[PDB]
């Protein structure tokens, strides 16, 4: 006689150990995972062979840690099923007994969909007994790899796929993933070498806009393991010289836990938290190369060998800007050296823009940071160039309502419109280049 195994693949986003009873748990309200491919293997002979020297929990553990040691995972006759849209996948008609013993079956996730890490290789030793079960329901868990932007200037923010930023903003990002359940295991059929020799986390942006600041924390099970790890693991950022040697990305970092000077101490630490969720957090600074009309996302790649990776995309960021064309009234003649300050309202209070890193700039202003002051004489005096289509541009601005205040006309002219109210449109240069006239004075 036989038994069926019904798998219900589900998403894991946290630490948990749901003891599989064997029963159907109805509608659990968990998110299913589609496209997971499972193989099944009869490990009965192998299990009872081990059961001579080790107890059942230990024997089961040994096969779980090193399943490829006990079965040929590459077998073409090994029954295979892929999980449907409801997470469902069934192996049917498996022998309930094998060479006179109650059968023991192993399950291996051969193909894990993006962006998930595999369910641990599970084993089921029969029977599962009724007060036996013919259909045994299992609930294998795929750990979702995530990347989120969590804070801006050390303040929490709503999780969005698109954020509006200002130059000088410090962005906190978090990449989350699972330490493998078999991280500490040795390689299949090798008593001296290890199973994992690479635990690489590669975060990068293809477009300019961020400067790497710091690796802020590495958390697991509410423990900051960054201190214990540091020096013993490989790490580099785009601020380092040897970044450019392997990658040509503007921004990023590559963190290998097992690529450092002391992989074995690291592996030992990781083994204490095997199966648990690690948060790697880091800060970046929005810089003068962050331009409008340009969404800029990052990508994180978790990999345990050269030939595969779990890839995930973080949110995009964008910044605002504005163009003005200061001209002679009644013509397209561009007027250099007209003077403005930038104003916004904060409640019913005028604040004025102070720009950092803009000595030497006239016409195009691309600051490293913008702060705001109620002292109007401290405001950065912006000057126009003689350029043809627009002779005053500002970028790195949050969207919203501003006023360009003309504080001095260019020589030979008088101010026509002192205040010029305008709007920064999120992520763009704005609807149009705003024209500002100055009237010439017939000097004698």
Numbering used by the authors: 37 to 167, 171 to 483
The authors write:
So-called major pilins polymerize head-to-tail into the pilus backbone, with ancillary pilins added at the tip (adhesin) and base (anchor). The L. rhamnosus GG genome also carries the genes for another pilus operon called spaFED9. The tertiary organization of GG-SpaD is a tandem assembly of three Ig-like domains, wherein a middle domain (M-domain) joins together the N- and C-terminal regions (N- and C-domains) of the pilin subunit.
In the orthorhombic crystal the three domains are arranged linearly with an elongated shape 125 Å in length. This we call GG-SpaDC for the closed conformational state. The N-domain shows the atypical K–D isopeptide bond, involving the uncommon YPKD pilin motif. In the structure of the N-domain there is clear continuous electron density between Lys45 and Asp181 within the C-terminal region of the first (A) and last (G) β-strands, which indicates the formation of an isopeptide bond in a trans configuration. Catalytic Glu145 from β-strand E is situated in close proximity and forms a hydrogen bond with the O moiety of the K–D isopeptide bond. The side chain of Lys180 points outward from the core of the CnaB fold into a cavity formed by the extended and hook-shaped AB loop. Residues Glu52 and Arg66 form a salt bridge between the two ends of the AB loop, and thus cover Lys180. The two GG-SpaD molecules in the asymmetric unit for the closed conformational state are stacked linearly head-to-tail, with the C-domain (tail) of one GG-SpaD subunit docked into a groove-like hydrophobic opening in the N-domain (head) of the neighboring subunit. Also located in the groove of the N-domain is the linking lysine (Lys180), which lies within covalent bonding distance of the C-terminal LPXTG-motif threonine (Thr487) in another pilin subunit. The interface between the C- and N-terminal regions of adjacent GG-SpaD subunits encompasses a surface area of ~765 Å2, with eight hydrogen bonds and two salt bridges.
